[PDB]
Design a protein around this ligand. Structure first.
Ligand code: CAP
Ligand code: CAP
Ligand code: CAP
Ligand code: MG
Ligand code: MG
Ligand code: MG
Lengths: 450, 449, 449
C-alpha cells in the first residue's frame, strides 16, 4: 500500500486489453480540461465510473481490482472506448447501468464536456431483461392491421380541454381514419381535465369509433403521475375499461417506475406507448449528454412497445442517418456497427421483441413520401396539428392523412419512386379526395430545414 | 376557425402580462436558430410547453386558452420569463412539472439551445407537496449531534468489496471519528456484494462502532434498484435492521419511484439521503440543460432529508456563489432573488422542512477551513478517498477529518478568521493529533482550480 | 414440403458445426439398438430433445429450424456431443432444462441405454439463476468458524424417536463437539415425531448447547413435505424459532418446489442444506442415467448452501477422482475440463456463490485423514452412527470426532503427511483424548471398498 494521489491513467488505461463478449462497452466523446491529456481524461471516466476514486486507499488491497475495474482500451482522437466487466452491474436494472456509466463522471473539473455516444449491451446481460411486452408482430395481430404504417395523432390543445370536449376530438379523429390517438405528454390529471373523467369519455369514443368504421382503434391514455402507485392505479383503470393501450413518460417518470408500469402492463394485457419527454435536455448537443441511441437500447431492454424516434423532416431536430440506425436498433435482431449511422458497436438483441418507432412532430401530408421512405411500414405516424389543423376539422384531417399514407404505400408496392413522384402521387390522390387537396393547399409552404 | 400556421408570438408573447402569485414562473436562457427573432423563440417554448402546437386547430375554440396558455411576459437579452397558470399542473407531481416545462421544448429546430435557469414554485402549488420527512432539527435530535458539520465518507473501492470486507471498512470509519458512511451511488446489488449480505454485515459494524465510541452512528444503505417494488423491499429490510437511514439515487431511479420511496421511508421512520447521480448530464453546460438549483427545488418538494450540492473546492465542478444560493434554497424558509448567486425569483417555501446540504468529492483536511466557511454547521462533509487514503488506513484518516472539523469550528467560535488562519489552526490541532499531521503532509500539494 | 419419415441424421447431425459460447452443450454416452448406427442414434437424441419428431411435418416450414435445432457436432466412440441454442431454454428454469435434455430421449427403442455425463451451462444462461443464498464464506462468518472442516451428524435411529428424545440426542451431539446435527432425509412429520414438536424441542437443544460450549451451533431442520406450501410454512416457523438452517430433500421434493423454498430461505435469512435423496436411482449405473456432477451443477444454479457429495471411503458408492471434480464444480469460480475427473467441458460459474460439499455415510474417526486430504477445509463431515455408536454415547462420540478432525488439521498445517502418518496422528491425539481412543478401538476393523 503506497498512499497518495497518482494519475488515473496508471491503473485505468490499458490500451492492450481485449474486450470480452461479456464486457459492457461504452463510446465516450471527451473534451478534456486544457492541460489534461486525453489519456488522463478517459482514465478518469473509466475510474470514477467503476471502482476508483481520487487517491489510493488501503481497501483496494482487500479485493481484486484487476477483475472488476473498468478499462479504457482504445482512443481514436476525442473518442474513448471503455470496457466494463459483467460482474459490475446488477441484473435487470437500467437504474444500475446509469448510476455507474453516467453517475458522477459528467461533472468532473478535469473533463469539461462528455457525451456517451453508444453502448454495447452484452448478450449475457441482455438475458436479464424481459424486453417489450407485446412487440410489433403481436400488436399487429391485436389491431388486425398489416402492410402499412399506422396512423396516430396527439389531441390539441395540449392542455385546457374538458374530458368531454376532449373525447369529441378523439372521436372525430378515430372515425375519420386514424388508427389511434394519444394524451399529450403533459396531460396527466389536472383541474380542467381529471384522468378518471378523460378515461371514461375517451373509451366511449374509442368504442363508438371502432363500431362505426369497423377498424380496431386505440387511444394512448397517459398514466404518468407523481408516484409509482398512482401510475399503476391509472393503468388498472384503463384495463378495466377495455383499453388496449396506456401511455407513460418513461424519462420524466423515471426508469424505476417505468419498469414497474411495464410489468403491470403485461400482467393486465395492456400495450405500452412510451414518450421520450425530457430527452432533448441531454441528447441534443453533440459535445455533452447522452445520445438517444443509448436511451433507445435502454427503452427496448426494459420493454416499451413503441417509442418516439423523430421525424427528421418535422419541427423537432433529428438527423436522418442517425435515425435510420436507431430504427434498426429498435426493430432488428442483430444490428452491425456502422460509422455512417453512428453505430459504434454491433448489437445482438438475444431474441428480445422489437419496438414500434413513432414519428411525431410538425408533420403533414406533404411529409408522407419522406416518412414512408425513412421508416417503412413498421412505424407510427402521428399527425396532431396536421389533423386538427385541417380547414374542416379533425375528421377531415384524419381522412386526409390516411388516404395520403395509403396512397404512398400503394405507389411503393407498385414500384414507383415515392421520393421523386411524391408530389405526383399526392396530387393524384387529391383529385379524388378533397380533404387531401385542402390539406395540401394549406400546408404547401410549411417546411422545416433538414 | 382560421386554419393555418401562425407565429407563436401572436398568442404566446404578452409583454404586458402581470405575473400572478399563483403562476409558475420560469427563467429560460435561449439561443434561437439564426434568423428566428428572440420574441418568437420565447413564444415557441411558451406554446409547446403548455397549450399550443405548430398550427392552428379548431379545438382551440372548445376551451378558453386565454385562461390556460403560458405567456412569455418579459425578455432580457437572451433570458425569457414565462408564466404558467396554476391550473396547468397536477397537484404534488414533479413528474408533471417536468412533462410540461422540459418535455419537448429543448429539441425544437427553432431554438438551437435552451437552459432552464430558475423556477418560481408558487405557494399555492407548494402546499400540495409534503416536503422532507425528517428535516435538520429532527435529524440532529435523532443523532444527538449539535454545533458542527456532520462527518461522513463513501466506502472505497466503489465496487468490488465483499460484504465482509466492506463492513470492516465501515467499522474502522465509524470507530475512528466519522458520524456516517455511505454506499457508493453505483453499489446496488451485484454478484460481488449482494444487498442482503451488505445490509446485515454493515449494521453489525454500525452497532459495534456506536457501542465503542458511545456516539450514535449511521450508514447510508443504498436501496436504488431496477424497480420501485424492489427499492421498497430493500427499504423495508433496512428498517427491520434498526438502520437510521436509507439512500436513493433519485435521478437515475426517477422522480416517480423517488416519491414512492420517500413516502415509505417516513412510514418506516427512516431518514432519506439523496444522491444526485446523473445531474451533470444536464446541469453542467451553461447553454443547454437544467441548472441544478431547479433540481434542488424539486428535491425539496418531494422530500429528501439531504442532497449533494458539491464542494466548490473538490474534484467536481461547482460555483461558489451559486452553491451558496443552493444551500439557502435547501435550508431556509424564504430566499430573496439575487442575481449575484443566480436566483431569478423570490422563493417562499411555505413551511416545508429544510434539507441537509452534503459536500463530497475530492476533499481532504486542507479544505475544511473553506468548507466550514461556505456551508457552516448545517451540512455534511463526506471524506471518501480522504479517509481511506490516509497513510494508516480508514481509522486514522477518520480521526484526522473529525479533528480537523472540530478544530475549525472551535476557532470560528473563538472569533478567529478561519480563512486567514486556516493553515495555522490546522497545524495547532496536528500538534495533538498525529493522524492529522500525516493527513496534512500527504495531501499538502493536492489542489483543484 | 416433402412429407415422410426421414432419418434423424439428415437434419440433426452436423459434424461441421462450431459450438458457440451461448449454446448449451451435452455429453451423452449412447448405447444404440443393434443395427442403429451411432450417428443416427445421436441425431435422434438431438432431434427428440429439441425440435424434431418421428416424421417430417408441414409446420417445420413455419419457423427457421436452422436457428433452433440441436446439433450433434462431435462423436468420440460412444460419446455424442450435442449443442443446444440459447433460445431453446426458459431463463432460470432447471425444470425446463430437464424437460428438454432428459424428458423423452431416455426411453426410445432406437437407443437401448443413454447416460448424460456432463453439461456445459453457458454464462449467458447462468446469469438468469441466483445461485446459493448464503455461500461458503458468508456461512463461516455466521458461525465464526474458520480453518477446519465443519462437523455434523444425522440423528439416529432414522425414525421412531419422540420429539423429546430426539432433541436429547441433538443436545448430546452439539454439547460434545459437533458443530451441527440434522434430521434424516426421511424424517418429515410423522405420528411418532411431528414437525412442530421437533422444531421446538431441537432449538431448545441448540440454544442450550451454544450456551454451555460458547460456540455457535445449528441444526438442519427438514422442511421437506408433500406440497410447496407445507415446506414454506415449516421454513417460516424454523425462522421464527431462530434456527440458522433448514433442510430440504431437493430431488424428492422436486426442482420446482426446491426453487420456491430457496427463494423463501433467503427472504427469511435461512441457510439451506440440501439432501440429494433419490440421486442413486439415476446416477449409479455407468450405462444409463444422469451422472451426479450434472445434478450438482443444477443444484448450485438454483441455490443450495450445502449438498452431499459422497465420502468415497464410506458406506455409499463414490469414485475418488470424480468426487474431486465435483468439489471443484461446487466451490470454484471456473473449472477447466479434465478427462481424468470426468469433466467434459470447461465450466465458468459467472460469479455464483460456492456450495459446501458434504461427506456423510458410514464414516468414523479412522476416515478423517482421508477425508481431510480429499476435501480440504471447506467441507462438512457428518458422523451419524460414528457419533451415537460410540461406546459412551453421543457426547463422547462427538468429542472423539471433533478431536480427530482438529488433530489431523493441525498435523497438515505443521507440514506432516496426513496420509502416511494418518494412524500416528490419531494415536498421538488419543493420548490426551480417551473418547478418541475408545472409538478407534471399536471401529478398528470397519472398512468399505
Ligand atoms: O407535443 C408535441 O409537439 C407533440 O404532441 C406533437 O404535436 P403536433 O403533432 O401537433 O406537431 C409530440 O409530443 C411531439 O412530436 C413529441 O416530439 P418527439 O416525438 O420528438 O418526442
Ligand atoms: O463517487 C464519488 O466520487 C463520491 O463517492 C466521492 O468519493 P470521494 O469523496 O472519495 O472523492 C461521491 O459520490 C461524489 O462526491 C458525488 O459527487 P456530488 O458530490 O457532486 O454528488
Ligand atoms: O441416511 C443415511 O445413511 C445418512 O443419514 C448417514 O447416516 P450415518 O451418518 O449414520 O451413516 C445420510 O443421509 C447418508 O449418508 C446420505 O447419503 P449421501 O451422503 O450419499 O447423500
Ligand atoms: Mg406531445
Ligand atoms: Mg459515489
Ligand atoms: Mg440420512
Amino acid at each position: 500500500y503506497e498512499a497518495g494521489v497518482r494519475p488515473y491513467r496508471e491503473t485505468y488505461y490499458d490500451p492492450d486489453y481485449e474486450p470480452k463478449d461479456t464486457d459492457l462497452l461504452c463510446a465516450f466523446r471527451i473534451t478534456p480540461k486544457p492541460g489534461v491529456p486525453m489519456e488522463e481524461a478517459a482514465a478518469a471516466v473509466a475510474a470514477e465510473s467503476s471502482t476508483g476514486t481520487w487517491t489510493e486507499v488501503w481497501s483496494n488491497l482487500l479485493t481484486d481490482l484487476e477483475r472488476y475495474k473498468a478499462r479504457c482500451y482504445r482512443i481514436e482522437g476525442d473518442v474513448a472506448y471503455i470496457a466494463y466487466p459483467l460482474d459490475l452491474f446488477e441484473e435487470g436494472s437500467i437504474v444500475n447501468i446509469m448510476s455507474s456509466i453516467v453517475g458522477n463522471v459528467f461533472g468532473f473539473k478535469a473533463v469539461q464536456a462528455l457525451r456517451l455516444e453508444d453502448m454495447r449491451i452484452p448478450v449475457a446481460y441482455l438475458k436479464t431483461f424481459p424486453g417489450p411486452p407485446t412487440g410489433i408482430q403481436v400488436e399487429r395481430d391485436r389491431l388486425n392491421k398489416y402492410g402499412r404504417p399506422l396512423l396516430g395523432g396527439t389531441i390539441k390543445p395540449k392542455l385546457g380541454l374538458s374530458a368531454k370536449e376532449y373525447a369529441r376530438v378523439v372521436y372525430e379523429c378515430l372515425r375519420g381514419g386514424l388508427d389511434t390517438t394519444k394524451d399529450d405528454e403533459n396531460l396527466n390529471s389536472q383541474p380542467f381535465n381529471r384522468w378518471r373523467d378523460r378515461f371514461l369519455y375517451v373509451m366511449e369514443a374509442v368504442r363508438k369509433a371502432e363500431a362505426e368504421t369497423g377498424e380496431r382503434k386505440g387511444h394512448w391514455l397517459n398514466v404518468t403521475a407523481g408516484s409509482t402507485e398512482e401510475m399503476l392505479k391509472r393503468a388498472e383503470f384503463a384495463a378495466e375499461l377495455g383499453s388496449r393501450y396506456i401511455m407513460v413518460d418513461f424519462l420524466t417518470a423515471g426508469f424505476a417506475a417505468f419498469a414497474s408500469v411495464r410489468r403491470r402492463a403485461e400482467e393486465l394485457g395492456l400495450m405500452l406507448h412510451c414518450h421520450r419527454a425530457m430527452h432533448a435536455v441531454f441528447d441534443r448537443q453533440p459535445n455533452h449528454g447522452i445520445h438517444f441511441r443509448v436511451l433507445a437500447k435502454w427503452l427496448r431492454m426494459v420493454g416499451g412497445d413503441h417509442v418516439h424516434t423523430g421525424t427528421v423532416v418535422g419541427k423537432l431536430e433529428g438527423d436522418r442517418a442517425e435515425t435510420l440506425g436507431i430504427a434498426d436498433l429498435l426493430r432488428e435482431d442483430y444490428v452491425p456497427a456502422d460509422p455512417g449511422r453512428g453505430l459504434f458497436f454491433d448489437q445482438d438483441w438475444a431474441g428480445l421483441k422489437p419496438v414500434f418507432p413513432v414519428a411525431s412532430g410538425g408533420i403533414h401530408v406533404w411529409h408522407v413520401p419522406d416518412l414512408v421512405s425513412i421508416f417503412g411500414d413498421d412505424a407510427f405516424f402521428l399527425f396532431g396539428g396536421g389533423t386538427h389543423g385541417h380547414p374542416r376539422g379533425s375528421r377531415a384531417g384524419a381522412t386526409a392523412n390516411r388516404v395520403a399514407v395509403e396512397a404512398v404505400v400503394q405507389a411503393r408496392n407498385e414500384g414507383r419512386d415515392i421520393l421523386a413522384e411524391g408530389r405526383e402521387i399526392l396530387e393524384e390522390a387529391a383529385r379524388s379526395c378533397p380533404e387531401l387537396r385542402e390539406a395540401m393547399e394549406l400546408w404547401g409552404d410549411v417546411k422545416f430545414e433538414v
